[PDB]
């Protein structure tokens, strides 16, 4: 029942990083109106219409005090991760 967080207000607290457990982890900070559900997706380079982000954290939120951690699995190759308008490249082995 939360609204989707304003896509213009995210920044990297931790850019996408190898977790050690065959997943990608990251943390965003959010400067807008809370609480809200984080819009997160990923694409493989050249394929902008097909989301490839498989979330281990399926319902990531920014609570009034807390939230921002995201864990996902990505398919091999060049990918782009988007949290709102915020992006980062990820090359997956």
């Amino acid at each position, epitope marked *: 029942t939360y*609204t*989707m967080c*304003d896509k*213009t207000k995210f920044t990297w607290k931790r850019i996408p990083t190898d977790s050690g457990h065959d997943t990608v982890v990251m943390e965003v900070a959010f400067s807008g*109106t*809370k*609480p809200c559900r984080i819009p997160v997706r990923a694409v493989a380079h050249g394929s902008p219409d097909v989301n490839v982000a498989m979330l281990m954290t399926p319902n990531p939120t920014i609570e*009034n005090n807390g939230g921002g951690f995201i864990e996902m699995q990505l398919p091999p190759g060049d990918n782009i991760i988007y949290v709102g308008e915020l992006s980062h490249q990820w090359f997956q082995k």
Partner: antibody
Amino acid sequence: QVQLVESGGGVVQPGRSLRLSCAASGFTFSNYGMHWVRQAPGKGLDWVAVISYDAISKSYADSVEGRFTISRDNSKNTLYLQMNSLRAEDSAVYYCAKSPTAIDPPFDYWGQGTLVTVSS
Amino acid sequence: EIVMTQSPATLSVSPGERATLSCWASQSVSSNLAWYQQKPGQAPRLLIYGASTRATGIPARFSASGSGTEFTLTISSLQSEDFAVYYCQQYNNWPPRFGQGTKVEIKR
């Protein structure tokens, strides 16, 4: 220049329905969140509802939840407020307000308002 | 529930003089705080967002500061068109909430 023009206000009887609309021009409507705010005569500003740029997210003040529905038509650049089960205390000038971003306040541009009077 | 309280209710200031308006929040709203100006019979106009950033087209004599639970709007040289009702609005938390307003009138 950004322009917001409300219509649909008038007299409506208690218990009945009224649809307000807001025609937007001068900006890419579908990029911005949109809000409704109201102001009873002689009183303060009163947030009513929000709809995100893509109409996926909606939120309502407690005072109107379950009675009002916000929606938008991004091809016609139009914002709507469907107001059901109107009560006397819903009487107010109704403003549409634009967000500078995707859904959040503040309200960077405002329409002129449309007067809604709930009365018999 | 976040309660926004403005102070004072009404402010009389001689023209060309300074006016200082306060906004209190019942808990922290960080810097997600806006100020609006509404003149009689007109729609409101955004003056300040992000607690301290002047909106487009707002003259430099409007300034604002604060964060957390305490915020201030200042008009350093009050001109004839600056006389209106001023509202604060927190938008750190859903639902966003307006203060009840401060009326700034001319002293004569």
